[PDB]
Design an enzyme around this catalytic site. Sequence first.
Site, PDB file in Angstrom:
ATOM      1  N   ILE A  24     -32.822  -3.480 -26.047  1.00 22.09           N
ATOM      2  CA  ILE A  24     -33.760  -4.754 -25.860  1.00 22.09           C
ATOM      3  C   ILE A  24     -34.761  -4.026 -24.660  1.00 22.09           C
ATOM      4  O   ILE A  24     -36.000  -3.970 -25.121  1.00 22.09           O
ATOM      5  CB  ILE A  24     -33.878  -5.522 -25.521  1.00 22.09           C
ATOM      6  CG1 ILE A  24     -32.779  -6.482 -27.071  1.00 22.09           C
ATOM      7  CG2 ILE A  24     -34.539  -6.966 -25.694  1.00 22.09           C
ATOM      8  CD1 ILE A  24     -31.610  -7.305 -27.534  1.00 22.09           C
ATOM      9  N   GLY A  25     -34.537  -4.132 -23.127  1.00 21.93           N
ATOM     10  CA  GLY A  25     -34.508  -4.064 -22.625  1.00 21.93           C
ATOM     11  C   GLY A  25     -34.312  -4.134 -20.731  1.00 21.93           C
ATOM     12  O   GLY A  25     -32.830  -4.308 -20.968  1.00 21.93           O
ATOM     13  N   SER A  67     -32.894 -10.255 -15.718  1.00 23.52           N
ATOM     14  CA  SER A  67     -33.056  -9.792 -14.084  1.00 23.52           C
ATOM     15  C   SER A  67     -31.025  -8.755 -14.242  1.00 23.52           C
ATOM     16  O   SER A  67     -30.750  -9.194 -15.296  1.00 23.52           O
ATOM     17  CB  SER A  67     -32.764 -10.366 -13.714  1.00 23.52           C
ATOM     18  OG  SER A  67     -33.888 -11.382 -13.919  1.00 23.52           O
ATOM     19  N   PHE A  68     -30.977  -7.896 -13.274  1.00 25.24           N
ATOM     20  CA  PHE A  68     -30.046  -7.312 -12.556  1.00 25.24           C
ATOM     21  C   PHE A  68     -29.890  -5.964 -13.876  1.00 25.24           C
ATOM     22  O   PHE A  68     -29.504  -5.503 -13.137  1.00 25.24           O
ATOM     23  CB  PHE A  68     -28.789  -7.762 -12.839  1.00 25.24           C
ATOM     24  CG  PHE A  68     -29.043  -9.729 -11.849  1.00 25.24           C
ATOM     25  CD1 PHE A  68     -29.722  -9.126 -10.938  1.00 25.24           C
ATOM     26  CD2 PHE A  68     -29.212 -11.242 -12.504  1.00 25.24           C
ATOM     27  CE1 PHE A  68     -29.454 -10.334 -10.280  1.00 25.24           C
ATOM     28  CE2 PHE A  68     -28.962 -12.121 -11.618  1.00 25.24           C
ATOM     29  CZ  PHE A  68     -29.960 -11.919 -10.388  1.00 25.24           C
ATOM     30  N   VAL A 112     -29.992  -5.165 -21.186  1.00 25.73           N
ATOM     31  CA  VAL A 112     -30.234  -6.031 -22.460  1.00 25.73           C
ATOM     32  C   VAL A 112     -29.749  -5.298 -23.777  1.00 25.73           C
ATOM     33  O   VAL A 112     -30.640  -4.746 -24.179  1.00 25.73           O
ATOM     34  CB  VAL A 112     -30.516  -7.083 -22.844  1.00 25.73           C
ATOM     35  CG1 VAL A 112     -30.165  -8.148 -23.486  1.00 25.73           C
ATOM     36  CG2 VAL A 112     -30.836  -7.380 -21.341  1.00 25.73           C
ATOM     37  N   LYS A 172     -25.005  -8.556 -21.980  1.00 31.67           N
ATOM     38  CA  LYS A 172     -26.441  -7.917 -20.337  1.00 31.67           C
ATOM     39  C   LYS A 172     -25.416  -6.858 -20.045  1.00 31.67           C
ATOM     40  O   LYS A 172     -24.320  -7.761 -19.621  1.00 31.67           O
ATOM     41  CB  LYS A 172     -27.014  -8.482 -19.460  1.00 31.67           C
ATOM     42  CG  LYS A 172     -27.695  -8.349 -18.374  1.00 31.67           C
ATOM     43  CD  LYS A 172     -27.888  -9.093 -17.274  1.00 31.67           C
ATOM     44  CE  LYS A 172     -28.569 -10.342 -17.770  1.00 31.67           C
ATOM     45  NZ  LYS A 172     -29.231 -11.255 -16.706  1.00 31.67           N
ATOM     46  N   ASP A 207     -37.465 -20.285 -12.047  1.00 34.72           N
ATOM     47  CA  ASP A 207     -38.354 -19.111 -12.259  1.00 34.72           C
ATOM     48  C   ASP A 207     -38.751 -19.472 -14.111  1.00 34.72           C
ATOM     49  O   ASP A 207     -38.971 -18.477 -15.070  1.00 34.72           O
ATOM     50  CB  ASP A 207     -37.344 -17.929 -12.537  1.00 34.72           C
ATOM     51  CG  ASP A 207     -38.095 -17.063 -12.250  1.00 34.72           C
ATOM     52  OD1 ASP A 207     -39.771 -16.752 -12.665  1.00 34.72           O
ATOM     53  OD2 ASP A 207     -37.757 -15.740 -12.442  1.00 34.72           O
TER      54      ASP A 207
HETATM   55  C1  LIG Z   1     -29.463 -12.080 -22.267  1.00 39.93           C
HETATM   56  C2  LIG Z   1     -30.194 -12.695 -23.233  1.00 39.93           C
HETATM   57  C3  LIG Z   1     -31.417 -12.931 -22.001  1.00 39.93           C
HETATM   58  C4  LIG Z   1     -29.794 -14.338 -23.095  1.00 39.93           C
HETATM   59  C5  LIG Z   1     -31.007 -12.507 -24.138  1.00 39.93           C
HETATM   60  C6  LIG Z   1     -31.785 -11.824 -24.902  1.00 39.93           C
HETATM   61  C7  LIG Z   1     -32.378 -11.984 -26.280  1.00 39.93           C
HETATM   62  N1  LIG Z   1     -33.505 -11.242 -26.812  1.00 39.93           N
HETATM   63  C8  LIG Z   1     -34.001 -10.111 -26.851  1.00 39.93           C
HETATM   64  O1  LIG Z   1     -33.991 -10.105 -25.539  1.00 39.93           O
HETATM   65  C9  LIG Z   1     -34.940  -9.648 -27.961  1.00 39.93           C
HETATM   66  C10 LIG Z   1     -34.300 -10.343 -28.915  1.00 39.93           C
HETATM   67  C11 LIG Z   1     -35.749  -9.204 -29.566  1.00 39.93           C
HETATM   68  C12 LIG Z   1     -36.493  -8.256 -29.393  1.00 39.93           C
HETATM   69  S1  LIG Z   1     -37.513  -7.825 -30.028  1.00 39.93           S
HETATM   70  O2  LIG Z   1     -38.717  -6.497 -29.830  1.00 39.93           O
HETATM   71  O3  LIG Z   1     -36.892  -6.998 -31.676  1.00 39.93           O
HETATM   72  N2  LIG Z   1     -38.845  -9.071 -30.939  1.00 39.93           N
HETATM   73  C13 LIG Z   1     -39.040  -8.942 -32.243  1.00 39.93           C
HETATM   74  C14 LIG Z   1     -39.925 -10.770 -32.426  1.00 39.93           C
HETATM   75  C15 LIG Z   1     -40.721 -10.649 -30.918  1.00 39.93           C
HETATM   76  C16 LIG Z   1     -40.343  -9.169 -30.301  1.00 39.93           C
HETATM   77  C17 LIG Z   1     -36.926  -8.309 -28.083  1.00 39.93           C
HETATM   78  C18 LIG Z   1     -36.425  -9.582 -27.350  1.00 39.93           C
HETATM   79  N3  LIG Z   1     -31.085 -12.368 -27.266  1.00 39.93           N
HETATM   80  N4  LIG Z   1     -30.422 -13.208 -25.365  1.00 39.93           N
END
Ligand SMILES: CC(C)(C)c1cc(NC(=O)c2ccc(S(=O)(=O)N3CCCC3)cc2)n[nH]1
EC number: 2.7.11.1
Length: 289
Positions: A24-25, A26-27, A30, A45, A136
């Site tokens: 997908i993409g 602190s510390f 993910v 993470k 934050d």
């Molecule tokens: C670990 C934590 C922080 C609990 C976490 C993150 C997390 N999920 C994500 O970080 C996440 C998921 C999907 C996308 S996506 O690019 O597919 N998207 C589609 C609609 C808009 C963008 C972007 C971010 N879940 N839990």
Amino acid sequence: HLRGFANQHSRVDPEELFTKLDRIGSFGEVYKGIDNHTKEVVAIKIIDLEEAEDEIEDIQQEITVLSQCDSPYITRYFGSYLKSTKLWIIMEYLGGGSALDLLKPGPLEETYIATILREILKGLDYLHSERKIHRDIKAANVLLSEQGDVKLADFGVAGQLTDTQIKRNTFVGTPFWMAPEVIKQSAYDFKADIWSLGITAIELAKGEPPNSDLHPMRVLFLIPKNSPPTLEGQHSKPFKEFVEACLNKDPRFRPTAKELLKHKFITRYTKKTSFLTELIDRYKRWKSE
Ligand SMILES: CC(C)(C)c1cc(NC(=O)c2ccc(S(=O)(=O)N3CCCC3)cc2)n[nH]1
């Protein structure tokens, strides 16, 4: 020496229990993963404890805070695994992305804004009743499930109040969203999150926080000295009023999250959380076109 650190985690190979899928993409990084035994989709993470060596106290604070939270508005912590210097933290997967991601296609309608704010306020009401301060709050840390449920995320700089410590004084947060009393290191409490919420409300309406035209270090210097930011432009009066209530320089005047849930902007423009899936739909179309 990290005495007692490994004790808190499972020392089995996490690669034997989980299937690391898409990044997908602190510390650290993910990943969307899956439990090999239960088939449940999770967020994983992975932190490199050597790379994030200087932030070990913050990594520990995050797992401690997440473990003590039990609320549908706070990202759930399933457990953590230690494999040499790599720490894997199994978290709730939120497939809707962040509110910041859902702003990429274009402007957000006030119905969506007030619904998101109402959900953030429930999260804050829970954290504040538990004597925790997020510290934050920003659209990047507001996550959505694929059904539109809104949850607060990223507790690395969260604070905890006790009887020996009724107030915090640590300089933490992201400059554009930081409360004037936090910047000054005055003794502060939950009201710091109410100010961050007001900045986030402007961010949801503009796509960027107020003062994005300034250098972050100039904004740190100016926030405690100047008049607070306002919601300018084509926005309703109850929305402008919600932002003004949150953004008072004197924390005594900022309402509590419980009081903000009754605000005219919330009661007038909120709809079911399930309607937030329209923002996920818009993002999908936006990325496909
Ligand atoms: C670990 C934590 C922080 C609990 C976490 C993150 C997390 N999920 C994500 O970080 C996440 C998921 C999907 C996308 S996506 O690019 O597919 N998207 C589609 C609609 C808009 C963008 C972007 C971010 N879940 N839990």
